[PDB]
């Protein structure tokens, strides 16, 4: 039922469950280039966040989805529904944030957390560089509301990077598939999140993957995470820019994953 609403799909064969969880602006199809590198050795679970354009917009209850907690409830519901007892989890952007909270709620559930394009807090603070200020983000939210199509038009290449047209085309496609109001509302939710208070409570081994230049995550965030996460943590840096390496640099990302994943 949640399995149907969130387009859960399980493919591959192997002992380890690999759980792939997409971020803002895409759906599980953003994993399609790396997926063949794993389906021979991992039982792979994919799903769409409720805010994905591929999910019936009728399921997006703006009354319910006001913080990340209902999203974590969705993930744990899927995990439980599938009867998954242990898995490796790869979360991009918001799914990274969701993964951290899930790990603290259910520490026995994750063998490993791989976090791509992950920030615990986007807004700056005293001695903390998240990369954004409140005045600044209000204008983005206005632009997103005023003219979503124009925002996407400009944002997709900036976010994804240069000379990767296939990646930009795909990211534009999935952004345009999201309902504009859902896009804005999810953005607001993410920008009002602050995980820095609970990072020390993470116990699961974690790999933080960053790219060279991510418009949403300053380079300094990775070393903050290394110093603040409570598990055994490593940082890997892709020699490639952009926010969506699963589309823009699938070979390098898959290589990093193959190094970091259990088995």
Author numbering: 5 to 267
Paper text:
The OsKAI2 and AtKAI2 structures were also compared to the analogous receptors for SL signaling in both rice OsD14 (49), and in the model plant Arabidopsis, AtD14. To that end, we determined a new AtD14 crystal structure at a higher resolution (2 Å) than the previously reported structures and was hence applied here for comparative analysis. Structural superposition with OsKAI2 showed an RMSD of 1.2 Å over 265 Cα and 1.2 Å over 264 Cα for OsD14 and AtD14 respectively, and both D14s gave a sequence identity of 56%, confirming high structural similarity in all four proteins examined here. However, there are some clear differences in both the positioning and type of residue found in the pocket when comparing the KAI2s and D14s. Most noticeably, F27/F26 in OsKAI2 and AtKAI2 are shifted by 1.2 Å in respect to the positioning of F28 in both D14s. Similarly, F195 in both KAI2s is shifted into the pocket by 2.7 Å when compared to F195 in both D14s. Furthermore, both KAI2s possess Y125/124 in place of F126 in D14s, with the hydroxyl group reaching 1.3 Å further into the pocket; similarly, both KAI2s possess the larger hydrophobic I194 in place of V194 seen in the D14s. Conversely, we found that A220 in both rice and Arabidopsis KAI2s is replaced with S220 in D14s which is slightly larger and more polar, perhaps indicating a role in strigolactone binding. Collectively, the differences between KAI2 and D14s demonstrate that distinct residues reach further into the pocket in the KAI2s, suggesting an adapted and more compact pocket to better fit KL/SL-like ligands. Generally, SL receptor D14 responds to (+)-GR24 due to its similarity to natural SLs, whilst KAI2 proteins tend to respond to (−)-GR24 more readily.
